[PDB]
DNA sequence: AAGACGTGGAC
DNA sequence: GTCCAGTCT
């Protein structure tokens with residue numbers, strides 16, 4: 477019922493679509509930025525960040541020209557920071573080799589960093605009307621129920637079948653709305669738990685409702701257990717009130733974000749005190765707390781300490797005043813290190 | 823193929 | 834506690 481569906485869906489969309497910030501216009505830059513911020517992050521959490529981000533980086537060019545350190549700062553607390561580094565590059569590429577005009581050709585836009593199959597379709601379909609499908613988690617949930625597909629949505633293969641299923645039922649007349657409509661539906665109706673089928677605008681066409689198995693779809697593999705990793709962190713202060721920080725390595729975990737000197741303790745303050753060299757003296761642990769990641773959990777332990785000078789501060793390290801820390805981008809884990817330390821000493 | 827890659831907010 | 838939750842390698 478390719479046509480009956482669209483009509484029922486698109487309409488529901490027209491009257492139920494939320495008035496979200498990135499929906500004010502169809503500007504390719506705005507859309508692209510929100511689509512990237514929304515990856516594995518909830519809309520409510522993204523709204524504030526989006527607004528600040530665009531306020532500070534009004535256009536693709538403004539973003540293109542900004543120092544990456546600023547870019548990270550703007551992303552501070554959002555998670556999966558590699559996303560903004562990829563967007564910063566992609567943009568710099570679009571300014572230089574594309575005349576500041578975001579490609580409207582799948583193959584083209586797709587070569588930019590951070591732009592996978594989903595982004596290509598979301599951005600080009602909503603902003604440029606290109607009929608490419610935009611299949612993400614929500615869409616896969618919706619489609620898997622509508623058509624009763626029981627394949628693991630983890631398999632990129634499934635992503636392709638779902639994508640194929642979109643190429644045949646979408647409303648080629650208005651792809652962008654069809655694609656967002658499908659996404660809103662999964663967001664406000666066809667939810668992960670307790671989907672509201674009784675009031676769904678497309679309940680009809682839903683094989684899953686007919687069979688009473690909607691709450692059992694989509695089929696997903698259960699996440700495995702994550703590694704637990706203890707970490708020693710040093711909060712070193714001068715006599716004048718200056719702390720020691722370093723910029724993490726540009727590749728891997730929390731890439732390019734600043735932090736307080738740390739090291740894996742498989743080791744106590746000994747293992748940490750060693751890494752210092754320097755000229756630092758540490759004492760008993762101020763506190764110990766956890767901090768989860770997708771693939772592991774940090775077992776943190778703070779160690780206070782005085783920093784006596786005796787040489788330059790080079791390498792990744794950097795001497796910084798207290799009224800200047802708030803300018804660096806730190807992971808949520810170390811923002812708590814400082815918070816714990818500051819209330820301790822006060 | 824499957825692990826790497828943040829962080830928070832419902833149940 | 835668990836589920837949610839794209840792209841790069």
Ligand SMILES: Nc1ncnc2[nH]cnc12
Pocket residue numbers: 496511514519598656659663
């Ligand atoms: N364009 C969009 N609008 C609302 N929620 C979304 N989640 C992912 N893309 C979205």
Ligand code: SF4
Pocket residue numbers: 618621622665666667671672673674676677678679680682684685690
């Ligand atoms: S009927 Fe229920 S399960 Fe089917 S699409 Fe609508 S909300 Fe989703």
Ligand SMILES: [Ca+2]
Pocket residue numbers: 586587588591592593
């Ligand atoms: Ca690509």
